[PDB]
Amino acid sequence: TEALLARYRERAEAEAKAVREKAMARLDEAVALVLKEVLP
Amino acid sequence: MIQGVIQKIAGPAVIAKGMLGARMYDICKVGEEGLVGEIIRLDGDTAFVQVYEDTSGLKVGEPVVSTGLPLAVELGPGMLNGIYDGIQRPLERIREKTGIYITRGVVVHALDREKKWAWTPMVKPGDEVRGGMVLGTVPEFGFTHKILVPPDVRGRVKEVKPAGEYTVEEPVVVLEDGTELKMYHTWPVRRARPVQRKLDPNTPFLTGMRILDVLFPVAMGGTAAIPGPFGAGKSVTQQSLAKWSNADVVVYVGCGERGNEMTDVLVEFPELTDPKTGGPLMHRTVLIANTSNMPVAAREASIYVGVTIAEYFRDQGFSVALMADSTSRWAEALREISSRLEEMPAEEGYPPYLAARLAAFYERAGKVITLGGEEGAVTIVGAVSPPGGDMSEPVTQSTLRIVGAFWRLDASLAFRRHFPAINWNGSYSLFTSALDPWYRENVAEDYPELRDAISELLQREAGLQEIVQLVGPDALQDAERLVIEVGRIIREDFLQQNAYHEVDAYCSMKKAYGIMKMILAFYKEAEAAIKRGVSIDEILQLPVLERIGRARYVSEEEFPAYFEEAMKEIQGAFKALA
Amino acid sequence: PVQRKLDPNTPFLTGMRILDVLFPVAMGGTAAIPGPFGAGKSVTQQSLAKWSNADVVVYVGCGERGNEMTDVLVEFPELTDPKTGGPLMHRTVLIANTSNMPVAAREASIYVGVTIAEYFRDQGFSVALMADSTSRWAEALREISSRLEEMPAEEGYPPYLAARLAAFYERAGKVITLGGEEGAVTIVGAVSP
Amino acid sequence: ESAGELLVATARTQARGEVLEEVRRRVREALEALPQKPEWPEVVRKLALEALEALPGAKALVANPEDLPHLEALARERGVELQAEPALRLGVRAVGAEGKTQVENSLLARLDRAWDALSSKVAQALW
Amino acid sequence: DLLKKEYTGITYISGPLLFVENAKDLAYGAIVDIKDGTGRVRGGQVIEVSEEYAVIQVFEETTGLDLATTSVSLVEDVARLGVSKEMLGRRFNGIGKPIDGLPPITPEKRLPITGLPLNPVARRKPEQFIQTGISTIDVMNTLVRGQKLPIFSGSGLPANEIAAQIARQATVRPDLSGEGEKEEPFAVVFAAMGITQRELSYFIQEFERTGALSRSVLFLNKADDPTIERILTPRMALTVAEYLAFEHDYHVLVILTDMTNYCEALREIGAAREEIPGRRGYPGYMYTDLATIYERAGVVEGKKGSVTQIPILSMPDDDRTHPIPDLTGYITEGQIQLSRELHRKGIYPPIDPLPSLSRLMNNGVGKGKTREDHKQVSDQLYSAYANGVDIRKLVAIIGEDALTENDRRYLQFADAFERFFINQGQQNRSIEESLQIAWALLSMLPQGELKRISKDHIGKYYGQKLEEIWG
Amino acid sequence: KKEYTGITYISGPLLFVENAKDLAYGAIVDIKDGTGRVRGGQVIEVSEEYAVIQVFEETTGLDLATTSVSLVEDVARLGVSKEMLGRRFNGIGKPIDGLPPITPEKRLPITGLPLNPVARRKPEQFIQTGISTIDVMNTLVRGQKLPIFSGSGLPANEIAAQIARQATVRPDLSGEGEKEEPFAVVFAAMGITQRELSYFIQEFERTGALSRSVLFLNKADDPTIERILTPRMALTVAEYLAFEHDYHVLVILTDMTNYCEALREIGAAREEIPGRRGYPGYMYTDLATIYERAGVVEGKKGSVTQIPILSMPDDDRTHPIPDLTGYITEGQIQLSRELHRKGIYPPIDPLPSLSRLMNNGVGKGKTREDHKQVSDQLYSAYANGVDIRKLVAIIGEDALTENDRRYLQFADAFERFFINQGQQNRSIEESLQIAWALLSMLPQGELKRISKDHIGKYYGQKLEEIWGAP
Amino acid sequence: IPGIRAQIRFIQQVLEQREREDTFRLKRIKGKIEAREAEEE
Ligand SMILES: Nc1ncnc2c1ncn2[C@@H]1O[C@H](COP(=O)(O)OP(=O)(O)OP(O)(O)=S)[C@@H](O)[C@H]1O
Ligand SMILES: Nc1ncnc2c1ncn2[C@@H]1O[C@H](COP(=O)(O)OP(=O)(O)O)[C@@H](O)[C@H]1O
Ligand SMILES: [Mg+2]
């Protein structure tokens, strides 16, 4: 029903926000790894 | 600028050397007379230029100057009533400046520089404007012509002129950073004008012909092709759509065809009236005329100018219809250019990119949401003139794969003087399903079923015609002969349409619906009479058949009374005759 | 090379009554067979490979569909040889080319197969060579001819198609080998109009 | 009753793409302003040497006007002329012997032509 | 300007082409004079000029030329022909040089033979109906003033006889249009390309007997004359026609004896230049080249005179799908197609109406121009004839005895139509005679089947009988 | 990044670059101009003096002075992943749905390697397309190439979308019950207009079919080289999915006529002499390299099934494209115009249709013991109905025999109910039940092709599933 | 049927001859382009 679809979209956006927040922490380490790998 | 000299002259092709740095598809002034040319091939220090005019009398060594810009059109107020050539030069100005003969090298602005337009601002200083937003409005012939920002111009409004009379050159709007916006802007003809998104073609395009608007409809954003051998009635059909369409603006492109038909349009259309606005019909029609005796290189320019003007008017929220009088002429011009270029053809002389050019031209149509936020749509009806009626010719076969509708003409009906001479078996349309809600809401709740029944009867008649050709028409049973007779009735008094008769020329959707309902009611009553043993030949003598035949000559205003009376007459005739 | 060609005076017994009786083919002769979809052409060829008096069978697939070739490749290892009772593949050589394999390989497949057949014949055996479809091979030959920009002749087929077909079909015939031992090659070249 | 798959996939993909685009922007803005770092002459020396090595014949090297006084050793070794262009910030333009062929080792080009291979490892290291 | 410069150093002479080097100052499309060692001077036109060498097409044959002595000299930058009113009773060859023995024409002007494209705004609507005297033309395929109405012919079909009859009989009907004035006779510009001796003699004798030679400009290109003059001939003839019509208010009727010969010459030039061909080997620009000839006819706003074109072309084997008739039909306004079957029946003129067409018919006929029923009668005749032809096709299967009386009636209409309406011989039928014959023919059918005619016209005209017109 | 300045010739799609020996043949290059706009290009001929680059897009604005060319990759490569499901692409691997670009697990050449003939195996299990005229009489087996022969006006796209959002496997019929077997649909659109593109997007998203679909949509106004590459990209993704993740992949190619025309134009551009009928002489081999990438592999549980869709140019099967497709593919499904104009959808004509692998995919343990017999009986009965319906036009209803009238009724009800399915999703059991109900109209015992046991088991039912109880 | 078959085969022969002529002319133009590119350099 409509309630199920609304719950699905709410939970999808919530877990997307969770993924974004959990990747924010490791962003800097990832950027440092990319920088050290690219530069010869 | 890039300046060179003429190295070799061969018909409409001039090779200029010393043109390093010149860009492909740029405009060049070939010769001392400054003939308009386009660079189509670069080879070292030399450039290959196709001259949009006549090269007779040119001498080797004359200067060639490259303007550094591609072919462009002036888009703005002042086009809605004039006739233009392939490179958008006003033919009235050419006649005034040269006489009854079109002479090469005449330079004249596409938009009149003396006409004053009642400018009316629609923006305020400090406002942020994007491409396609409305800077203001100007009345042209009752059309609220909107002044638009060029699609790739961004900035903030600084100063806007007050309401008054100004020419197209007047910078009515001056943005910050010194950007001046005039009443008109130039656009390259080969770049499709950007849009926000494409919409689904929900509404139909009312051509005013019973067969085209009923059996094979074309939607508002759709594309149609009408191929046929010479004499079938392609151009008369194009003129009929121009006269009786429901499109706000009509762009007629006479690519490489007769000049007499262009004269006929220029003379008849001012007298005819706009079915919706009520004013003269000529006030909504833009003609790009490239007669067959004009230079071949101008045909591609004519097609592109027409479609670009159609796109520009679509950007103003109008509903534009674009009828190309011939695309096979464009293909032949491309073939001549390729022959000059010494290239290997793909099929029957045409260069390999002809299919890509046709696809790009036909894909410019469609209903879109403009960058200004409003709604606009362009419908393209492309006429095809195959050599000898050969529908396997590469132009027709490439058109078959990109059009949403296909109106095939056959020489058999043209010889019989049965017009519009549409080959029902060879025609199709892909918009029937998408237009059903509109037909239900605007015609009747059962219009799709009625049209499907008519198509089924025509299909049955076509299937039985095979046996008719084998055993004759009288060797069939009563039911099959009745089907044949009903198909004949349909063909003779529903699909037929006299494009010159004052009343039969236009036929609204409801009149065609009434005629279809009358014909199908007659079919059901005749089938009931046959099933009970009444002779078919007795049925064929009913004067109500003559009433059905005459139904198409009744005027729109007084049609519904005739429809009700004829339905009552059908019921009474087949109840009395059982 | 061979020592001497012999007259078609002995029968190639296929084990099927209609072909062996009404329309016989000599040991070393050439036959053709057009194969419709459901007409059991594959079953007929299997019976030729299984029951004929030929010692060694060579099967050549020029441009067969992948699944049609796969059926053959899966089913031959299962068929049994009546002469010995073991698998039939122990006297069969398969040359298989699908339509997506290189065109030159598809064109040279029949020559490779017939050369292998002639080599087996030179050992004194009787060989039945079965081209699975000569129309696919002719299509490959037409493709190669077009790639070489030769005159299309009739229906695009190169003007030397008849010459190549004659050269392929003349390799069949009962011969006396260079070693003085009798052998034969029989060709059943299927056509698909 | 099956749109949940599309919804969750779109949400996860949007989060992943936004995170990776932020990685792009942060690494791009960090790699900028290299001459402000005192170790820039060494890395641009490496850039110039690899650029001239890629070309069998070098005519001239074009770089930032302020970066010219840091590339004289290889210029004297190879005879290439130093040319000043403000547009070539943080990069060395290598010109072939004839001038038809030319190599650029701009840092943005480095990142653009490396990210396609890097992304597979970057995603696994990040998540 | 008038000083002579000679370009020697020819490097190639094959077929009609000729290459000359160090001629970079020869304008494109210029006319040159080729002088050989014997002193004879040929003609030539530049078709491709570059800084290396220029290509010149030779009007005459190349026999006797030699690379060591031949000399090429410029005449003028643009091919121009001297035109004047004095040439009304003159003959000329394919290149405008007089062949009647009279002194050369004193040119009032020198106009470019290539012409200029008429401005569509300056064109008028062709509305003046012309009563040709032929029923199949006057009624069903009406020819108006300023129209392009080619006659599609065959090998043995008498197209030249039909054209001569039209030129002898064609006139306007001032009273029917309400003008009520006397009208000057037509001036006939006769262009002949590859014309044989029989055809030329017949035309000369016909124009002598009718007395039109005193007002007819003739450009004659014999069949044995060089085939490159056929390229220039129609352009010169149409230039003279345009000059007369639009500078002296003459009404010019132009007859192009054979466009198939012109197409053959164009194909020869294209193949010599290795131009990319269209269908059947004809050059790609054949459509444009024929358009530049046909589109020179019409009427001009504010000008009294007009140019009416009646091209004659022979379809190779009666193949209407051939490139020549196809392109002509695409360019011109309809066609008058002759039928071989009708000719075999002895029906002259053998004009079968079904493939015939006149696009400007509606502008010339109707109420206040010829008669109110003209268009409706034409449509009814076309429909009934097509039904009769279909019924003939049905007879060819089921026999005449199996038909109903309706199909028998339509078949009788069809064969009486062919025997009376089309077949008129050498008589000059007025439009009223043609219309009354058409109504008499339609009277054979039941009155209720005239579904394409309004009841007013039916009541006013239905009822007449064929035997009543002539006994 | 190497940049190859020194363009010396530009004409149409071609441009010549000098001193560019380092460019590998077939490589993709990036053409840049004065404005900074970058175009696409493919190296079609490389030599010591110069290389020939064929430009994807239009060459307007290019010039010999400022044009620059740079290589991007030596061989045409596509980055594939399992996350491609639920995405849309422009036929060259670039997302067009607005979602961020995928993270490629691996990058594979689009010109996939041929399957080893001994590596394949027999197609054995069928695919349920939800269409009665396809499931029952023209069964599609996993690994088959079953083209759909359409016409100019026939609704091929609607049938394609219906099959795409209705196709499914039936593990319960085989007794496996393996719902663990994934299913994916790879859709390749070539030379489609905006209307067809919008229709496909809406149809794929309205029923959630996008969750198991990968869309390679190439517009009609896109460069033709992209049209050529689109089936290669789609088949590469399908092969990767099927043979690296055990997926059962169904591939739909629309429309192969547009692909052949693009191949024709590109071959003509490279100054190649056309073969038969003006098409390239190597058209057969190229179409084979496309089609023969479908099938099943011994030892692997994946499968690729192809449904090419091509429009006959004049409903003519003698045209080179349908001729070669019939040469390469196993059978065909032919759409009928007379059925379509009678209001029947899907307009599939059983008489000219054929499935060459049908006999191996139906029967005991696959669909049902009576499938093949029912299909044969339906074919024969429909042929009899059609010929009797043609005869009744001349001889009348009464003159026919009673069984002829029964065949008339059978043919009419067949066209009304079996073929005229509409927008339903019919499992094979439902279609078989409808077929048995239709055959029940014919007298028992006249059904010669079906054995008496199956007749006793199923004959007798009446028509209520389509009308009266949907 | 025999007459229609003869007509069909005659039309097929004519079309094939036209296609052969087109291919021959294409070969001629390709060869002449190659030759004129070679000697002119
Ligand atoms: N000699 C035969 N005796 C009995 N059944 C046969 C025989 N030949 C063929 N069949 C039947 O035919 C079917 C298998 O052969 P087919 O599939 O028709 O061969 P095929 O498909 O024509 O092979 P191709 O054309 O090379 S793909 C089975 O139903 C067999 O029972
Ligand atoms: N709908 C129509 N109704 C009546 N006459 C028509 C109709 N269409 C065409 N005709 C007739 O056919 C002639 C040829 O039509 P036209 O359109 O000029 O040729 P084409 O097919 O090349 O466009 C017209 O001049 C007119 O007499
Ligand atoms: Mg027209």
Side-chain angles (χ1 to χ4, degrees), chain B residues 493-547:
Chain B
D493 62 64
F494 169 63
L495 298 187
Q496 269 200 174
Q497 196 154 358
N498 189 3
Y500 295 110
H501 189 279
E502 60 268 9
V503 180
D504 198 20
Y506 177 69
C507 188
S508 72
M509 283 307 299
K510 278 187 172 172
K511 179 173 171 185
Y513 171 78
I515 286 174
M516 282 204 296
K517 183 162 283 283
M518 288 188 298
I519 289 175
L520 289 178
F522 173 91
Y523 174 72
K524 305 317 288 185
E525 298 293 333
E527 195 171 19
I530 279 293
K531 273 185 296 180
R532 86 193 66 184
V534 184
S535 171
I536 176 175
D537 299 353
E538 162 66 20
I539 291 170
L540 288 194
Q541 314 309 104
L542 267 57
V544 75
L545 272 178
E546 313 305 323
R547 267 60 191 260

Side-chain angles (χ1 to χ4, degrees), chain C:
Chain C
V2 304
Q3 180 154 358
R4 183 177 65 257
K5 283 268 175 74
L6 301 179
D7 307 313
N9 58 354
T10 58
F12 162 64
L13 313 178
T14 76
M16 288 160 50
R17 276 181 294 273
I18 182 165
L19 303 180
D20 281 349
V21 171
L22 291 182
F23 313 102
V25 176
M27 178 63 75
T30 57
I33 188 167
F37 165 55
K41 181 261 288 180
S42 59
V43 175
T44 297
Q45 293 191 341
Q46 291 167 27
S47 297
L48 301 200
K50 188 179 161 82
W51 297 108
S52 66
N53 56 347
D55 300 297
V56 169
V57 177
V58 178
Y59 198 107
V60 184
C62 317
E64 304 318 297
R65 311 177 178 74
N67 305 289
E68 306 189 328
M69 203 82 254
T70 309
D71 301 343
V72 166
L73 303 184
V74 174
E75 77 189 2
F76 286 171
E78 309 307 321
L79 301 181
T80 181
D81 183 26
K83 199 63 61 177
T84 66
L88 181 60
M89 280 299 303
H90 293 288
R91 61 188 190 78
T92 307
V93 189
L94 294 174
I95 296 89
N97 301 268
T98 57
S99 293
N100 62 336
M101 293 186 84
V103 61
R106 291 187 279 122
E107 190 268 347
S109 68
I110 74 162
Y111 297 122
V112 162
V114 70
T115 302
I116 294 162
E118 289 185 303
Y119 165 72
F120 275 118
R121 168 207 70 189
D122 284 344
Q123 302 197 52
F125 302 132
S126 166
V127 182
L129 170 67
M130 319 188 65
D132 205 33
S133 188
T134 64
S135 298
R136 296 289 97 85
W137 173 84
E139 170 59 43
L141 181 77
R142 168 165 62 192
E143 169 166 345
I144 293 170
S145 166
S146 184
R147 200 176 300 284
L148 269 51
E149 306 169 343
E150 311 172 330
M151 216 63 213
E154 290 183 351
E155 293 206 14
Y157 288 105
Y160 52 79
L161 167 70
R164 297 302 164 83
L165 276 165
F168 166 64
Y169 273 108
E170 286 316 292
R171 283 165 169 258
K174 184 174 55 167
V175 311
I176 299 300
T177 60
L178 300 181
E181 189 160 17
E182 181 265 336
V185 174
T186 315
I187 297 184
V188 184
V191 298
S192 70

Side-chain angles (χ1 to χ4, degrees), chain B residues 120-140:
Chain B
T120 299
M122 280 277 196
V123 297
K124 298 190 299 285
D127 289 341
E128 273 198 309
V129 290
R130 280 82 53 83
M133 276 184 62
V134 176
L135 297 178
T137 60
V138 161
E140 201 150 12

Side-chain angles (χ1 to χ4, degrees), chain F residues 54-265:
Chain F
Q54 189 163 10
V55 180
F56 295 171
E57 319 199 317
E58 188 60 90
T59 49
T60 183
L62 293 170
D63 54 348
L64 299 186
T66 76
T67 305
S68 174
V69 168
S70 66
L71 172 67
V72 304
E73 56 183 11
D74 281 316
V75 182
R77 212 161 269 105
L78 168 71
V80 298
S81 170
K82 272 186 59 176
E83 69 176 318
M84 296 189 100
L85 300 167
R87 307 298 308 274
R88 303 193 254 114
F89 301 96
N90 70 333
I92 63 165
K94 301 184 182 177
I96 50 166
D97 51 352
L99 291 181
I102 68 169
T103 303
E105 188 169 15
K106 58 169 63 173
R107 287 177 57 76
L108 300 179
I110 77 186
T111 310
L113 304 173
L115 265 166
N116 193 324
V118 311
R120 313 173 83 113
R121 59 169 166 92
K122 270 191 174 183
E124 291 287 297
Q125 308 295 329
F126 85 107
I127 286 188
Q128 184 192 281
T129 63
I131 290 184
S132 298
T133 61
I134 300 177
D135 287 349
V136 163
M137 302 180 70
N138 304 286
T139 317
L140 175 61
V141 188
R142 297 211 287 253
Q144 193 180 7
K145 314 166 281 277
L146 191 56
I148 288 170
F149 283 1
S150 178
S152 303
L154 298 182
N157 299 333
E158 292 70 14
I159 303 167
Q162 175 171 10
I163 296 172
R165 62 175 165 75
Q166 284 179 0
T168 181
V169 290
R170 296 304 309 280
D172 47 355
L173 295 185
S174 309
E176 319 302 329
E178 288 185 332
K179 307 307 196 306
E180 55 163 31
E181 306 201 278
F183 197 86
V185 175
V186 181
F187 209 94
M190 292 162 288
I192 54 159
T193 70
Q194 180 58 35
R195 179 189 59 83
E196 303 172 310
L197 171 77
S198 182
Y199 172 76
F200 279 142
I201 293 166
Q202 166 64 10
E203 278 301 303
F204 263 97
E205 280 199 352
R206 83 176 178 78
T207 50
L210 197 66
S211 61
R212 58 173 144 93
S213 304
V214 184
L215 294 174
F216 285 94
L217 312 157
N218 167 270
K219 275 209 279 181
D221 56 358
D222 282 347
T224 56
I225 296 169
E226 308 184 12
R227 194 174 313 145
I228 284 307
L229 300 194
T230 287
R232 263 87 183 208
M233 305 275 176
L235 282 164
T236 289
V237 175
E239 285 188 293
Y240 160 68
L241 286 174
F243 303 137
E244 303 206 21
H245 302 296
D246 293 331
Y247 273 68
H248 289 285
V249 189
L250 171 60
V251 194
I252 306 186
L253 311 169
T254 298
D255 178 303
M256 296 307 294
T257 298
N258 301 340
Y259 171 86
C260 294
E261 297 298 336
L263 194 80
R264 183 176 179 179
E265 291 146 36

